[PDB]
Assembly symmetry: C3
Homo-oligomer: 283 residues x 3
Amino acid sequence: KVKVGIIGNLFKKVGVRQVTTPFGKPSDTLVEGFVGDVACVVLPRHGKGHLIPPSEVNYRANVWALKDLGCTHILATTACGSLQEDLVPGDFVVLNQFMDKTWGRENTFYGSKPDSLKGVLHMPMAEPFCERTRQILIQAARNKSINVYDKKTMDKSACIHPCVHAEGSAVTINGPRFSTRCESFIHKAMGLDIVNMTLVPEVSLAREAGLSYASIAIVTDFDCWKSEEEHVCVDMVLEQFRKSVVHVREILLEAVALIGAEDWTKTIEANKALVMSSRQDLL
Amino acid sequence: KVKVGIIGGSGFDDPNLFKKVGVRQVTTPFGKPSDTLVEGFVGDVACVVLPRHGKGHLIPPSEVNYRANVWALKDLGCTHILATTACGSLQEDLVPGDFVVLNQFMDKTWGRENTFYGSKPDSLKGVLHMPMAEPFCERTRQILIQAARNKSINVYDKKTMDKSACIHPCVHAEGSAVTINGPRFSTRCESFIHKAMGLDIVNMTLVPEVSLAREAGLSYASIAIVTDVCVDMVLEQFRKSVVHVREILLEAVALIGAEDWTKTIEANKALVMSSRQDLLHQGSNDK
Amino acid sequence: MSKVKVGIIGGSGFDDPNLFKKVGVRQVTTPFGKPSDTLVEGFVGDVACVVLPRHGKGHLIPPSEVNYRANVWALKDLGCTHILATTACGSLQEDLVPGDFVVLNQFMDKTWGRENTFYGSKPDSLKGVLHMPMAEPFCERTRQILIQAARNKSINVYDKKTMDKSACIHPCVHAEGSAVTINGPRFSTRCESFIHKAMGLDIVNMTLVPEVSLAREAGLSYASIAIVTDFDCWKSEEEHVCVDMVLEQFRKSVVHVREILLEAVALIGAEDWTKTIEANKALVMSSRQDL
Ligand SMILES: Nc1ncnc2[nH]cnc12
Ligand SMILES: Nc1ncnc2[nH]cnc12
């Protein structure tokens, strides 16, 4: 059976749970419940009161806690800034790629220090998300009558907002500061679609844990490559986030049902075997 | 009332900008500053100087306690920080002996304490996401440029002037730095990639200094010195550049003192508060 | 004093190489901690040589946790003047095919969190501020010795500066090349791979930096021979990199790497290095900004 963790009326809440992990405590307690008959657990990435900044989030504990609770999938959300004209505030992005600019975060479960699992794990990350789970997020958006924009098969002038972009690349910066204009334009020239602070190493550790992970990013701003009145700040992010979170909730809850309506035996076994085959110390 | 802090880089390890009236041997909640802070006056404008690398230049860029240096200057009541940095050029018109009043940067540093705020017990509580689109105090940048004009140094602004007005040595009116972690210099491969990205100079010390100054509600501006048989000529050129930057700094302090900064300082403090994500969540009863 | 002694740092596929008969096995410590493993001393011909596996005996130390400082300092303390190093890597360019080698001459550094200098202001480092030039970061004489060693072992050499593309005959040793060194342990995304390719980098690896930098800080002549084991992940899904792909290709190429390394040690031994060693030491002293 499947069980979907969510990192961030139609959700039946059962109770709240405190867990510990080999890598420390998660960001907060976890809300356990059900969507129809599918078990679901919800974890706030930045803790109660949003007091934990992106660089200090215990990604290892959060992903491992969901694994230890039996999660087979993780669906994740984050706010983000758009680097490109056709991704506008109020849009969503089902990411398929990233460029990592984070540092100083614990980004793997394995190593040679006592606080990590024994071994050397070199995971392939060419296409770093679970593709089946990406397509479920996109289909959930269709089921909730939210427009879907596929730049491979459509083009500008077919882009109807607010829309879910069917693909996109994120640069993840370490934070806590936002980017300079110089950095924003450099990331844009690299062809990246959005900028955020929390995707990495969350996505990497989910694959190390044998979990199917997909992210849907909420565009809250144009970073700072446009006009001065459109340069990102916290108030701007929060104002748009508050307008978009109801759509993102509808997508996520619809996707949990769609996951539970399919068989995942082979995908799960594939996930686990990918971890085993990536052990350099064992091979 | 204003008080100008000065962080002197290479060439300023033992600055003699004014007669020492007093010294402050202090620590901060974030550890020890690079050296004793030296107090005095430029005219009737109060000034505080500290050498980024300490006397004797014993502290490398990645080990400088940027948090403690900014905090210590804030603790003494500084409203402004003027900083110097010796840099290498990435573009043909930035020539050794030139200066740059930076307005942009690309950050390639890591492993440095770059914020006062967070969830660690020794951090200030709260989550601060500061805007950095234009990361310097613009009023203070223009003071540095005006100080150079007032001391008879060429100023070149590529936005309004053809490359024929680029007369060396000159202060470039704008420019971007890539800040690398050091201590090693860049490979040729790295230098050419930075050049292809359009960056003007390379240094090791701008970040997180500029970021922490904004977190502290201070007006910060930086003046870079472009520094690169020839070694003897490079060194003498650098000495002349340091004499020029000394003139610019002293004139800039006087120019800052000649104006009212009440509203700018209030805006500096208001920007910090508006960047507190944890407080803005609360103002709307979020979650 | 004109005595030469060649250290060898063995990467993946070199966890236990038989380059020579062991004379001494050295368990040492350094001011920067323990090296990756014991150091094996011996002779190749008349040339003294020291071998160290980068990842330890059972390949238990990931790239980001290797004590590069201790490895380089231990070799220096045993009297090495030179370090020859191997690394497995992925290709970012069509003319660099699995089974080729690359005598690197450039790099782009994307590592973090590693101790990358012997010098600093804290008690656990040597006293001083050392700013080493790195524009051409390898020892050029030692690079050319690796390239000559391949010629002497009848292994094709392809020099893009002087030869036409038609003279790129595989398997070959590329006479120049740039590496991007990523921190690991994960491999790159397709997005990252295409960005690195667009910057013009030739290969991707995890272990060159800070090893090459610390060697120069130590006054040692360092050169690297990279073994192409894969096309990273910018090509078809059947050529996307993974551990098994890396190991399988390496087993095939290790034989020729050993021949190059042993011939290179002999070629170093056949020349006088007095002025180059003096210049290596003088570059360290002139890069001290506290003095
Ligand atoms: N512009 C931006 N940069 C980084 N993280 C963000 N989160 C929301 N907007 C962002
Ligand atoms: N593609 C690759 N990336 C990083 N390190 C590697 N080692 C071998 N192949 C590699």
